[model samples]
Target: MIALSQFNSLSKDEAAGLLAPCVALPAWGETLVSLRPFASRHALLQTAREAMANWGEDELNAALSAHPRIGEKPTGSENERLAQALREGNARYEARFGRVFLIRAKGRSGEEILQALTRRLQHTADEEVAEALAQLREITMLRLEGAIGE
Candidate 1:
């Protein structure tokens, strides 16, 4: 992982490249690049949070397209059932919302993710979009922390 101090000194294109995998939208990374030299990790994260909050439907859709469906592989025999259920839920979610269902998923269990998917499927279009954006922000922040550190 690159240190926060090193990240602050990177060229714009280099910095943007490092941020590319954090979120799908190019503009999001570009915005962060334009506001470089953040005083601390907290400042950077706060700025990132503010930038995400301003995203519109187009940006949200762009970012969501990069995410995979919640559950990919079964960890064990017990999780196989959850994995299959998630596959079905993912299809239904895409059909209902016209986009991939996204959640942080990094530290969550298969059961937790499946439950979240079930709960989110019930949300109205607007509510689901808002929830998706919130999850996207969480994911982006986590990724940024991984990419740049103190």
Candidate 2:
């Protein structure tokens, strides 16, 4: 992880590049870059939260394209059975929702992710959209926390 001060001192392009892996949206990265020299990590994260909250369908779609289908790659701890299940679940979710299934998978078990997928499949389109955005925010924040430090 880079120090918060180091992050703040990066050039605009450099900072935005660092932020890109957290959230794929150029606009989102640009927003964070424009608000540089944050007082603390909390301030930066707070700003990120606010920026993410404003994301609409277009922004959501843009960002979603960056993430892999959960089971396509290792998300959380998983065995072959769980991995295969997740792969199937991802397909079903995409068929139903027309987008990849996303979740904050860092600390979750494969079973937890599978269960969440099952539950979220029942949501209405609008509800699923909201849920996806929330998940994206979680993933973005985790990446940010890992990438920058005080």
Candidate 3:
């Protein structure tokens, strides 16, 4: 993590590289770099939320591709690395939704994340689109929140 000031001070390519793990869209990261020199963490987060809200299905797919399932690397082969049946579950999930499963996993348990996934499985693309973006915002906020303590 780094201070907002430190983050703001980074060169364009460096800042976007730092932001890449936070969101998958290269454009989004580059845009954030363009909007740089944030005053406070909240301002940065609000900016991130607004930027993420404008995204559609393809952007969501792009962003989510970088996110692993919202749980641990479960014990099994490399193929079965995520928590519980989540590996298999994620396979089926992407097959249906056209993207990998995503949720705020930092604090939640594997069960909670899996349960959310199960419930979200019932969502149509349009319906799931909102959920996906909401989760994206959650993740972006977490990343910004992490930045504040540095």
Candidate 4:
């Protein structure tokens, strides 16, 4: 993990690279990069969480494009079999939700993420949007914590 001070000191391009994997939105990276010199890890995480809440529909869509459906599994990884099952769940979710689905997967198991996706399918579009934003915040903070040691 990089230090908070190191994160603050990165150049714009470097910071964007660091932040992009945390949150999928380009504006999020730019916004966070612009808001550098975060006082503490908490401050950075708090700001990162807040930044996700106010994005426009276009921005949300842009970020959504970066997320795989919750059940979509990754190949060529040690967890290949796990990803396969997850993909199945994600496929069902995508069918019902008619959009990319994301759940905070950091601490959750694939089964847990799939469960959340199943429940969230019952939510309205607006409700799902809110849910996505909340999930995005969780991802942002999770990634930020990985980037800057807690």
Q: Kindly report which residue stretches of model 4 are placed more than 4 angstroms away from their true locations once superposed.
A: 68-88
lDDT of each: 0.87, 0.87, 0.77, 0.76
In order of appearance, the predictions have TM-scores of 0.87, 0.87, 0.76, 0.76
Across 17-37, the per-residue lDDT of candidate 3 in tens digits comes to 888777678988888789988
Tens digits of per-residue lDDT for model 1, 1-150: 898888889999999999999989999899999999898989998899988888777788887675555444446776788878988998899889878878899889888999999999999999988888888888889988888887
Off by over 4 Å in 1: 66-77
Give me candidate 1's TM-score against the actual structure.
0.87
Q: How would you encode candidate 4's per-residue C-alpha lDDT over 42-69 as one tens digit per residue?
A: 8888887787777655666777775555
The root-mean-square deviation over C-alpha atoms between each candidate and the true structure, in angstroms, is 3.2, 3.5, 4.9, 4.4
Better of 1 and 2 by lDDT: 2
Q: How many collisions per candidate?
A: 0, 0, 1, 3
In the predicted model 2, the residue pairs found to clash are none
- Clashes, model 1: 0
Q: Which regions of candidate 2 are displaced past 4 Å? A: 66-81
On lDDT, the stronger of 1 and 3 is 1
